[PDB]
Design a protein around this nucleic acid. Structure first.
Lengths: 150, 120, 127, 74
RNA sequence: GGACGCUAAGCCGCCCGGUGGAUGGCUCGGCUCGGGGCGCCGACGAAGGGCGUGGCAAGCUGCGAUAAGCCCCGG
RNA sequence: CCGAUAGCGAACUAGUACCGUGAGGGAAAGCUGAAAAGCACCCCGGGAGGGGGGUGAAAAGAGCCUGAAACCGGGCGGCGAUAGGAGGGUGCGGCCCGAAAGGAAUGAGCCUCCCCGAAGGAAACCGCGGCGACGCGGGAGUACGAGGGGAGGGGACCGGGGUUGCACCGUCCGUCUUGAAACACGGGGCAGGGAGUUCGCGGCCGUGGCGAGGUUAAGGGGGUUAAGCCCCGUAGCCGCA
RNA sequence: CGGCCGCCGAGACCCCGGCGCACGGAGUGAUCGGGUAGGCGGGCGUGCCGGUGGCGUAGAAGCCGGGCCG
RNA sequence: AAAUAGGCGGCCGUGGACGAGGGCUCGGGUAGAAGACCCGG
């Protein structure tokens, strides 16, 4: 399914990503920040993060990171990978949106939310002839946009 | 088990019967006979026919709350109603006693008891 | 209702409520059971066994409800699972209520309900 | 019909189950020793019997004749 | 003055999607018992093992360069 | 009799993978659907991945029947940046919803009147006392009182659930201990596994049969597909000194 | 410190009903109600067997959430 | 942030209108672990 209902060929455009090897924490900060904006705005937001000129605040985790210029909370990071990955989704959402007959350049993001998938696991050595887990988490992330309304 | 309760229904039908007589004619003997039956099997009367001949007042009504156990000597004329008889025993009260009859037809003999003596 | 006094007393009991029926801590530990399913005191640290203040009422003999309320739903009617047309006979709107099961086919069920209304039997839900 | 477990139930949190302490139930020392556990013994390992008389002894004598020369009349 | 005029981060319950593999049904398998059979074989070169062998073969299974087989009889 | 964190170590290429100089040690891995129809063709995506559309059921679309909890994300309802905690219990307020299984519409929470009425038991004011505090007499066992009964009014929630404020109380759990909230011991959390069984003998008990007797074992005959039950067998044991 | 007086304040004590236990037959108890070690007694649940009697695509078990009773 | 949460003076408001203060920006530090602080533009 999808996490939020869709009336896809007449009021919504959707895309979802499966098994992206990307931090969950970084996914949380982006989903939270992008929600409620327009698609265009979302594009803009990603492009500055990738340049490394726009930190995205962590307001959902807060541990072991310095403070950053001016307003809002100090802890924050540049999720470059995640920013590049979501951009591809956005391009797909837009392309789908052109087919359906939807305007592709005004849709607002109602809902974006991130999901903790399977965990790709293995071993790396540590001392005393002991082996420790060396894991990367794999995340699924969905995006649903809905047409302007008043 | 390791706790009381008869599972012979015939015994139970008989114990219930004793109680009806006890309330209605309000006499003591039937109530005494029901308790004796309630006691264990090894605490149920074991009456010998030479023990009949040794003790009992002649001509009167003997009630036994267990089994009567024969191959003895008897020549004392007393009429016995009892819970069980041996086969050997049962012949001997007909022929040297009054006679053998079950404990349930004693209701018919004395509906409230006269002259009857419980014999353990 | 059933009676006036009965309608008060069942209400007085619901509102008051009977014990938790799970000894000590269960919000904090899903290790120990679900709020059903009372376990006998097996502690030596057990504040509930002593009957401490601030920790609730201990299950006792006393809590037992009147015979009329007990063993039945509180409107005095005695439940019968009925799965078939034959089972339905010998119920009465005088003291029985009938329960239709989930399983029952529609074909038999048409017959069960129609006979049940004729009998005067009250049912879970319409039909 | 009834089992041993049935009679124990799952109990009171006795964690022994009718033998009191769970530290006197862990082995054979607990019994006082396995088997009879001495009698004519100089140590009073088992001192007192199981009856009040304390201990009752064995090793007294009196002959039995050969089985063939005996007769016990009937 | 008291007012919801904006209280973020977060706490608690529930809900929806994922994760996870418990749960029920399912079982070409075990396990135990009763009956009968098998009741020896080999330097006349055994059993066991190895390596090959198939159109494509990684393992298993079957065979021996006559290589997942050849012949005869009966069914 | 057991059933895939069970029964053989092994139901599925298993004594395999694998480890060790060797002797020797030793796992895990069962399930599509009626039929594969196991996804043509098209848009997008560098993309073989994924997404959109077409796929009887696809929430049967590839260790795919079912699909728990712990847990992660978003949201809803409540609380929240000057106030205190074994995380709550009980009473009483707020806010929040409640289609069903409950009770009630043949009357729910609720309100009102009349009466009965346990334990208990005033006031106003008066009189007389008391250094006074205050007592005593009358008011008066009255007014009053839990609880119950009947009647009436109203007409849809109430119970119950989520969360929270206030008043009050509240130092886990299990074990060890004379004493545990403990600076005694043990626990990250959830799920699954997880501990009173069999035989012989002795002493008890309850029930049941028979009775001065009681009981047959082994065996073969017999019956049956086999077998049990049914009958024979009293060898032998025990009691009757 | 020595007198004195009025109140507050427990599951106590009192009181109404309900409930168990004990006793009464085939109502009664001023002289009944704490509870570890330990003894005694009753019920529930679980798998499979046998007998008996039912249910299922016109929708089973299981799962989830809610109601209700003891 | 002394909850007796202070005083004075000035500045301001009045998806889906408009937008005072303020930051991020740039050039440097009297400043400086990140951030902040300060000054010029």
């Amino acid at each position: 399914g999808y996490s939020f209902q869709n009336f896809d060929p007449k009021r919504m455009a959707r895309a979802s990503a499966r098994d992206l090897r990307i931090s969950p924490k970084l996914a949380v900060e982006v989903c939270r920040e992008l929600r409620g904006m327009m698609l265009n705005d979302a594009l803009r937001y990603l492009d500055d993060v990738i340049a490394l000129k726009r930190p995205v605040p962590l307001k959902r985790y807060n541990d072991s990171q310095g403070h950053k210029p001016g307003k809002g909370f100090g802890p924050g990071r540049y999720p470059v990978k995640v920013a590049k990955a979501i951009k591809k989704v956005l391009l797909n959402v837009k392309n789908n949106a052109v087919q359906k007959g939807l305007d592709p350049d005004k849709l607002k993001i109602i809902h974006i939310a991130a999901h903790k998938g399977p965990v790709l696991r293995g071993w790396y050595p540590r001392a005393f002839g002991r082996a420790t887990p060396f894991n990367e988490q794999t995340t699924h992330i969905e995006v649903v946009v809905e047409e302007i309304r008043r | 088990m390791k706790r009381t309760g008869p599972t012979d229904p015939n015994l139970r039908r008989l114990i219930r019967y004793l109680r009806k007589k006890s309330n209605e004619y309000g006499v003591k003997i039937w109530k005494d006979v029901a308790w004796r039956l309630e006691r264990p099997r090894r605490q149920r009367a074991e009456v010998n026919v030479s023990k009949i001949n040794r003790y009992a007042n002649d001509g009167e009504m003997i009630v036994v709350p267990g089994s009567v156990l024969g191959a003895g000597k008897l020549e004392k004329k007393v009429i016995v109603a009892a819970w069980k008889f041996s086969e050997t025993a049962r012949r001997k009260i007909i022929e040297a006693g009054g006679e053998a009859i079950t404990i349930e037809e004693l209701i018919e003999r004395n509906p409230t008891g006269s002259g009857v003596r419980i014999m353990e | 209702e059933k009676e006036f006094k009965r309608l008060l007393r069942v209400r007085a009991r619901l509102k008051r409520k009977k014990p938790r029926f799970l000894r000590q801590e269960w919000w904090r530990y899903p290790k120990f059971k679900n709020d059903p399913k009372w376990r006998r005191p097996k502690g030596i640290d057990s504040k509930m066994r002593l009957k401490l203040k601030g920790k609730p009422r201990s299950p006792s003999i006393g809590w037992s409800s009147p015979k009329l309320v007990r063993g039945l739903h509180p409107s005095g009617y005695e439940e019968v699972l009925v799965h078939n047309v034959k089972e339905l006979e010998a119920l009465d709107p005088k003291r029985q209520a009938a329960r239709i099961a989930h399983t029952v086919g529609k074909k038999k069920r048409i017959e069960i309900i129609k006979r049940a209304e004729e009998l005067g039997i009250k049912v879970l839900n319409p039909r | 019909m009834i089992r041993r477990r049935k009679k124990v139930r799952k109990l009171r949190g006795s964690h022994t189950h009718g033998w009191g302490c769970k530290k006197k139930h862990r082995g054979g020392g607990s019994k006082g020793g396995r088997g009879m556990a001495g009698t004519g013994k100089r140590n009073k390992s088992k001192w007192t019997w199981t009856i009040k008389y304390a201990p009752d002894h064995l090793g007294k004598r009196g002959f039995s004749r050969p089985p063939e020369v005996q007769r016990e009349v009937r």
